Amino acid sequence: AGAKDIRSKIASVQNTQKITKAMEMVAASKMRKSQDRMAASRPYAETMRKVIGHLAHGNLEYKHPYLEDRDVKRVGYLVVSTDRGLAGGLNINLFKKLLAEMKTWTDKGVQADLAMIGSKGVSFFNSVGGNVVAQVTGMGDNPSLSELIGPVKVMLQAYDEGRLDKLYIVSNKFINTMSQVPTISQLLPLPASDDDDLKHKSWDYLYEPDPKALLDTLLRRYVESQVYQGVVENLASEQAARMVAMKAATDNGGSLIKELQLVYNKARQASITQELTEIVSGAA
Amino acid sequence: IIYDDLSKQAVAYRQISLLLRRPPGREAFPGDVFYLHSRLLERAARVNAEYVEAFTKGEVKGKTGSLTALPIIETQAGDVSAFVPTNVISITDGQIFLETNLFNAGIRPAVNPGISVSRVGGAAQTKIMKKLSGGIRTALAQYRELAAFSQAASDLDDATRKQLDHGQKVTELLKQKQYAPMSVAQQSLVLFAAERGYLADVELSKIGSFEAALLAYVDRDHAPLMQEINQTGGYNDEIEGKLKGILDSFKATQSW
């Protein structure tokens, strides 16, 4: 304490507040660009799903390990997290919901399985001791599907080997610019999406080389696509969460400036009063 | 007795004393500034009937006199920790702290709970007021603190939600117009409606209307109970039952 160092503190906090305002602006713009990158990811997945519905709910409905439902003996989760802090509680809320469901299955005796996108989840579940068999990190603000191939290929291998009976993706949802929510959704076995049409009679595909081979490649591509969609939505959710966090930080910094200045001004007035009392009471 | 600004009196003693060259202390007031406000305010008191009898040479028997004092202090920037405000807080039986942030938000009168206190206790209050008020003070302080943290993060667990709704409705119920006094019967009906839960299903924007209509309803029909509660501030199960019927019937039968 001491008015000169108090003024130093005031200057430092003011500088901090300016930089957090700048970060809020940047976070909003990055949210915009990542939600444009989000929409471009829809068409690929949805046309792939129409083809898969045509084959899977058509009369040529093969029994494929990816498509069939069996009793749960092991279960796995693909989990998306940030590489960067200052996002508030997004990661922690998602991990709490994951911990709840992972507890619920393992009480049924089911061994849990984890694959991690982003380093924050890696550190968190290394501290928790969760069973992590694959991970990829450092994608930053430029995710790519080719990087996701590793962990998803590992989980898929465990799935068609019969070791895993169900497999979820764990991700936040960019419901709005103003609001997001953590979710857990089953990607394998293929969910019973409605996906009904009968126009397939008019145009039935000529399967080169084979129908079932094409179907397998389609399912593998679909799982890859859904994981990429979840990753991109979680990135947009990160940008929005950092935006709101920096807004709150800027306001709290200003509200601290307004208190430090009262402390400083009271010390200023007291110092003048005391020094002048010493001088006047010093004379004669 | 009202003293409109004891801070200005303290300034006056500064001027006279410093013109008499008396050495100053903290914030340039003399140490005698405590004694000034001390001996002034300490005259305000309640005296027993033996003192009244001895003073008046026996012309008045058995009565007890009193002088009630409401001193006013102006303080800079809401700082309750400056010298003269701290001196007077050390002399009175409590303080009523008015916050400029509440006043600018339209919450008027802008009483700040937690800082405001009445050290005399509930002994001043009547029975119905004491029973109906109870913990409203600390509930309001806790509501304000909870609103402070709730602004920061989202953690709503349904009892927090109802605590917030109740606190917001109570604060909207406490505000009041200038030059608009209301009697203990009206105040007790208001407190009863607040804490027996009747403001459930009532909108915040409807709270003022709900009160205006309720006081008109009780002025129209069940006036004799108002006369009774204004005469003796007595809280019985009979009167609680009558109030319960009045609020049940108003909430079910009337509109606002």
* Tokens (6 digits) for A148: 């996701």
CB-CB neighbors (< 8 A) of B153 in chain A: 89
B119 in active site: yes
Q: How far is CA B238 from the centre of its chain?
A: 28
Interface touch A277/B24, C-beta < 8 Å = yes
* Tokens (6 digits) for B22: 């008396």
Largest CA distance in chain B: 74
Q: To the nearest 10°, report the CA torsion of B111, B117, B120, B123.
A: 60
CA distance linking residue B53 with residue B65, whole number of Å: 11
Distance from the B173 Cα atom to the nearest Cα atom in chain A, whole angstroms: 29
Q: Domains in chain A, ordered, with CATH? A: 26-243 (3.40.1380.10)
CB-CB neighbors (< 8 A) of B28 in chain A: 273, 277
Resolution of this entry, Å: 4.0
Q: Which amino acid is at A245?
A: A
Q: Left, alpha or beta for A70 (phi > 0: left; psi -120 to 50: alpha)?
A: beta
CA distance linking residue B198 with residue A211, whole number of Å: 69
CA distance linking residue B98 with residue A215, whole number of Å: 74
List, as one string, the DSSP characters of A45-84: HHHHHHHHHHHHSSS-----TTT-----SEEEEEEE--SS
Interface touch B152/A248, C-beta < 8 Å = yes
**Helix (H, G, I), strand (E, B), or coil: what is residue A132?**
strand
A140 touches chain B (CB under 8 A): no
Distance from the B3 Cα atom to the nearest Cα atom in chain A, whole angstroms: 27
CA distance linking residue B109 with residue B96, whole number of Å: 11
Query: Which of B256, B136, B146, B150 lies closest to B205, judged by CA?
Result: B256
B42 touches chain A (CB under 8 A): no
* Tokens (6 digits) for A116: 């991690």
**Helix (H, G, I), strand (E, B), or coil: what is residue A198?**
coil
φ, ψ of residue A211 to 5 degrees: the values are: -70, -45
Give chain A's radius of gyration (CA, Å).
28
Q: Active-site residue among B119, B137, B161, B220?
A: B119
CA distance linking residue B160 with residue B199, whole number of Å: 17
Q: Which long-range contacts (CB under 8 A, 24 or more apart) does B166-172 make?
A: B166/B139, B167/B139, B167/B140, B167/B143, B168/B143, B168/B204, B169/B194, B169/B199, B169/B202, B169/B204, B169/B207, B170/B136, B170/B139, B170/B140, B170/B143, B170/B194, B171/B107, B171/B140, B171/B143, B172/B204, B172/B207, B172/B208
Interface touch B28/A89, C-beta < 8 Å = no
Interface touch B24/A266, C-beta < 8 Å = no
Size of interface A-B (CB pairs under 8 A): 11
Interface touch A277/B79, C-beta < 8 Å = no
* Tokens (6 digits) for B38: 């001390």
Residue A14 · residue A257 · CB < 8 Å? yes
Question: Which residues sit opposite B171 in a β-bridge?
Answer: none
Which B positions 79-138 lie with beta carbon below 8 A of chain A?
Answer: 79
Spatial CB neighbours of A83, under 8 Å, sequence gap ≥ 6: A118, A119, A120, A137, A138, A139, A140
φ, ψ of residue A207 to 5 degrees: the values are: -85, 105
* Tokens (6 digits) for B63: 């009565």
Count of beta carbons in the 10 Å neighbourhood of residue A12? 10
Residue A172 · residue A233 · CB < 8 Å? yes
Residue B131 · residue B233 · CB < 8 Å? no
Residue A216 · residue A190 · CB < 8 Å? no
* Tokens (6 digits) for A229: 């969609």
CA distance linking residue A155 with residue A153, whole number of Å: 6
Count of beta carbons in the 10 Å neighbourhood of residue B77? 11
Please provide the size of chain A in residues.
284
Interface touch B79/A281, C-beta < 8 Å = no
